[PDB]
Design a protein around this nucleic acid. Structure first.
Ligand SMILES: [Mg+2]
Ligand SMILES: [Mg+2]
Ligand SMILES: [Mg+2]
Ligand SMILES: [Mg+2]
Ligand SMILES: [Mg+2]
Ligand SMILES: [Mg+2]
Ligand SMILES: [Mg+2]
Ligand SMILES: [Mg+2]
Ligand SMILES: [Mg+2]
Ligand SMILES: [Mg+2]
Ligand SMILES: [Mg+2]
Ligand SMILES: [Mg+2]
Ligand SMILES: [Mg+2]
Ligand SMILES: [Mg+2]
Ligand SMILES: [Mg+2]
Ligand SMILES: [Mg+2]
Ligand SMILES: [Mg+2]
Ligand SMILES: [Mg+2]
Ligand SMILES: [Mg+2]
Ligand SMILES: [Mg+2]
Ligand SMILES: [Mg+2]
Ligand SMILES: [Mg+2]
Ligand SMILES: [Mg+2]
Ligand SMILES: [Mg+2]
Ligand SMILES: [Mg+2]
Ligand SMILES: [Mg+2]
Ligand SMILES: [Mg+2]
Ligand SMILES: [Mg+2]
Lengths: 394, 153, 15, 60
RNA sequence: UGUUCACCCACUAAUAGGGAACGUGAGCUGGGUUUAGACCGUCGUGAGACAGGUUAGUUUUACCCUACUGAUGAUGUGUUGU
RNA sequence: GAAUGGAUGAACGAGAUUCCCACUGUCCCUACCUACUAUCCAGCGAAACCACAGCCAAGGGAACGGGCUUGGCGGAAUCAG
RNA sequence: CCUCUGGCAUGUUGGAACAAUGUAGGUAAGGGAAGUCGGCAAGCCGGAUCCGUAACUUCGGGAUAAGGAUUGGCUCUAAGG
RNA sequence: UGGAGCCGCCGCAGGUGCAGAUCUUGGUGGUAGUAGCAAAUAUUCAAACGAGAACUUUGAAGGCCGAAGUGGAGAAGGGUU
């Protein structure tokens, strides 16, 4: 018989094999369509989820009840120290797909990057790209290099730069810097390639990719939760108290007579550590890192035009389970995928953004900087020292 | 006695067996496959590693429910265990064949474990008392081991 | 042998 | 080595529990060849086996 | 109401209809049917009967194979990593 | 329907109902914690069950096939469920 | 419930983990039986002293009815041989 | 391989030929190194013996039974424990 009282089914099939993702670094499954017209640029970046916090802002959507009313708002800090371009890699269209065609690597490559290429660095002699870099200083090699670049000019269509992180500049344990292919979207391929050939071995900061009040897509791996039962992993009803063989289950897997259990039926398995591409996360603040002209410039982070203090986005006692954000960072609206410390791919949108909400200009009023390691009540240490007065530790 | 598979050159091939040993036939079999073909000094090392869990014995044939372990990747296998009694029972046997080489007058650290073979031995039986007054068997499955080393270097 | 069912259970009851 | 007998006899001689029997762990072997009581009574007098005091339960 | 069914109240965009061994008891539950204990009515001389009412009444087993869920791996590419 | 006992009835009942107050994770709606398990390991080590076996759709067929026909197809050995 | 006298080695094993399902305990915002055949299960209540106690009744009961208040520590006073 | 009896022909004689009987007696697998060795809070350090110690013994500590006892004595029953 039919099921009596209808109800929409639990969980989406558009997300499954609900298995542990192969990758850790979230792949960009599609870069935006390079119109050939606008100038060249990078489409993606690779940051790190340092931590959350508040903002306060005046909102300007006329019509709303909240028009010209200061709301608060959660935000993620994605610490994003500049990447280093160490390669380009040409692709060519085929009817089979999109074959990689030619990879030209830079001359010098950091041990940050070289780390990646060995499973055990302690034990290696660190001999990678050793016979490669010989090419970059002779007649023969330099000529072959030029012919490779020329061939890419003749044949290739898509060009991706290879860059990698500056694992050096982070509070993370790891030294093995994440590489990633990032796509150069812009003018003609010959122009496109000579841009990336100029950028080779060079820094690239965040502000060169992204701008403020820009919708971007966060790509990463979800905070993993191990083996989980069907009630956790699918949000199935619990069965009642009296159930004899347990109650965090599904009762009827399936009907008798497709005499197999279907792929659509809810089963217990891996919950979390899935790959996920959340879209439309507006950049409220691209924040300038600590720098030196005479003394430190720690202010330039979490100070606003209306606050004017001497904060950084770092709260008291740091971001928890992370560190100090001593580098440039972006500040997205809302939560994003994954854990603290997780490497996170940003990506420019796939989509022509023209909604009132997606063109809204964000002027921040106040960044909360109170500790997250307990219930914080002081924004800065100087404020605390004022409020408390002197302590026995003096 | 007659061993299965008599040696090629008896001159330089010491022997051993140990009959009717309380060691799990199945565990003893897998660790005897592992050891087979080794140079006797490697074999001994390998069994003392198995004793302390620095190396495993991959359970290939008799692998039903036997757990995975990273140590098995050395062997090209997913299963693997650290059967201690089996290693203690064919570290004694190795000791004896090494004894007899020394007696025979062979170079002891040229000896390869050329042949080793775990047979089932007649079973013991003691009982286990079960629900609703049923009485089921609770039987050991002991094993005859025997082996042959040979001068190869 | 194994108990299985009670005398007054008589498993597959179809009166 | 093994002194469960010597603790029993000791206890019975002392007329205490065998909680209260204390055998000197340094001088074990001497106790080991005590087998009889009166051998044990000797070791009682020599101070190798001793009655422990009562566990104090203050009424205060 | 054990109900299927039914009806009523309320909300709603709408409160359409069915199938899958009248889907689904090693998924539950066991209220109801449908053992044995008992009561009542009608019937029977009686033992007993009653798609007539009532109340009390043991819901076993998965470690096999498959299927599904997730988990190591597999052949290939000389090996290995990207 | 009147000792096949009728009508009653305080006290009593691990007896059968219905409502109200309180109280609650019974529920909306699920969540977190603890211990013993299950898990992996050393040692030890049973049983039921077993024609052969074990991926499907449809067909016909003793009128609901694992095996047959026609199609889809098929990749060692395993682990927890 | 904790202790001395006396008695034991955790009930036929150990180690490492802390997943899902369980078994046995707990706790839960707002609502409070909307859950379910059914308040099943758990929760409320609980001792004592002082008040206060209905209908009904076989006048014995109902009755700890219900419903209220108080309770510690310390330093004193008075009353009982 | 084995180590002491055995066959051809003509007649006679029969407890004379097995795949099945939920057949009988004996043996052996797969299941499987799987289920399992989870009731009643608890172990730790050093030493001794010893081929060998998670488990013996001694000492030290931490715990429990908590006099309706896991203590001290019998009855019945066992029969040398
Ligand atoms: Mg429907
Ligand atoms: Mg039940
Ligand atoms: Mg916090
Ligand atoms: Mg039993
Ligand atoms: Mg019995
Ligand atoms: Mg049905
Ligand atoms: Mg079923
Ligand atoms: Mg059932
Ligand atoms: Mg019933
Ligand atoms: Mg009946
Ligand atoms: Mg298991
Ligand atoms: Mg009448
Ligand atoms: Mg009359
Ligand atoms: Mg009558
Ligand atoms: Mg069949
Ligand atoms: Mg215990
Ligand atoms: Mg123990
Ligand atoms: Mg016991
Ligand atoms: Mg609540
Ligand atoms: Mg309902
Ligand atoms: Mg209801
Ligand atoms: Mg109850
Ligand atoms: Mg009353
Ligand atoms: Mg003879
Ligand atoms: Mg005869
Ligand atoms: Mg036969
Ligand atoms: Mg096991
Ligand atoms: Mg006694």
């Amino acid at each position: 018989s039919h099921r009596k009282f209808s109800a929409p089914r639990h969980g989406s099939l558009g997300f499954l094999p609900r298995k542990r993702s192969s990758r850790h670094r979230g792949k960009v499954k599609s870069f935006p369509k390079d119109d050939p017209s606008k100038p060249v640029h990078l489409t993606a970046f690779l940051g790190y989820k340092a931590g959350m916090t508040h903002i306060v802002r005046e909102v300007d959507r006329p019509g709303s009840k909240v028009n010209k009313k200061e709301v608060v708002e959660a935000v993620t800090i994605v610490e994003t120290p500049p990447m280093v371009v160490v390669g380009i890699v040409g692709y060519v269209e085929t009817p089979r797909g999109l074959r990689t065609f030619k990879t030209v690597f830079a001359e010098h490559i950091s041990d940050e990057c070289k780390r990646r290429f060995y499973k055990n660095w302690h034990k290696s002699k660190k001999k990678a790209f050793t016979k490669y870099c010989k090419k970059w200083q002779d007649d023969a090699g330099k000529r072959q290099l030029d012919k490779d670049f020329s061939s890419m000019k003749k044949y290739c269509q898509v060009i991706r730069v290879l860059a990698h992180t500056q694992m050096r500049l982070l509070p993370l344990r790891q030294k093995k810097a994440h590489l990633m292919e990032i796509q150069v979207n812009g003018g003609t391929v010959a122009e496109k390639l000579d841009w990336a050939r100029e950028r080779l071995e060079q820094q690239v900061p965040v502000s060169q990719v992204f701008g403020q009040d820009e919708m971007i897509d966060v790509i990463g791996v979800t905070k993993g939760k191990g083996y989980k039962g069907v009630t956790s992993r699918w949000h199935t009803k619990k069965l009642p108290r009296k159930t004899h063989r347990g109650l965090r289950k599904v009762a009827c897997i399936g009907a008798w007579h497709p005499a197999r259990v279907a792929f659509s039926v809810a089963r217990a398995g891996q919950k979390g550590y899935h790959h996920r591409t959340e879209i439309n996360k507006k950049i409220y603040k691209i924040g300038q890192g600590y720098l030196i002209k005479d003394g430190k410039l720690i202010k330039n982070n979490a100070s606003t035009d209306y606050d004017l203090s001497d904060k950084s986005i770092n709260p008291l006692g740091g971001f928890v389970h992370y560190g100090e954000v001593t580098n440039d960072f972006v500040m997205l609206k809302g939560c994003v995928v994954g854990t603290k410390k997780r490497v996170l791919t940003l990506r420019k949108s796939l989509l022509v953004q023209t909604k009132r909400r997606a063109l809204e200009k964000i002027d921040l009023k106040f960044i909360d900087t109170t500790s997250k390691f307990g219930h914080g009540r002081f924004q800065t240490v100087e404020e605390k020292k004022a409020f408390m007065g002197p302590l026995k530790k003096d | 006695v007659r061993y299965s598979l008599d040696p090629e050159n008896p001159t330089k091939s010491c022997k051993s067996r140990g009959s009717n040993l309380r060691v799990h036939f199945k565990n003893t079999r897998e660790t005897a496959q592992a050891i087979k073909g080794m140079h006797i000094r490697k074999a001994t090392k390998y069994l003392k590693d198995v004793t302390l869990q620095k190396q495993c014995v991959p359970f290939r044939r008799y692998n039903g429910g036997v757990g995975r372990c990273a140590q098995a990747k050395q062997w090209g296998w997913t299963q693997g265990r650290w059967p201690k009694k089996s290693a203690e029972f064919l570290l004694h046997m190795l000791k004896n064949a090494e004894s007899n080489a020394e007696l025979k007058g062979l170079d002891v650290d040229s000896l390869v474990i050329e042949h080793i073979q775990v047979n089932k031995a007649p079973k013991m039986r003691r009982r286990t008392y079960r629900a609703h007054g049923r009485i089921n068997p609770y039987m050991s499955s002991p094993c005859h081991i025997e082996m042959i080393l040979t001068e190869k270097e | 042998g194994m108990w299985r069912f009670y005398t007054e259970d008589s498993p597959g009851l179809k009166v | 080595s093994m002194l469960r007998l010597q603790k029993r006899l000791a206890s019975s001689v002392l007329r205490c529990g065998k909680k209260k029997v204390w055998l000197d762990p340094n001088e074990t072997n001497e106790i080991a060849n005590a087998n009889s009581r009166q051998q044990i009574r000797k070791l009682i007098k020599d101070g190798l086996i001793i009655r422990k005091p009562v566990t104090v339960h203050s009424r205060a």
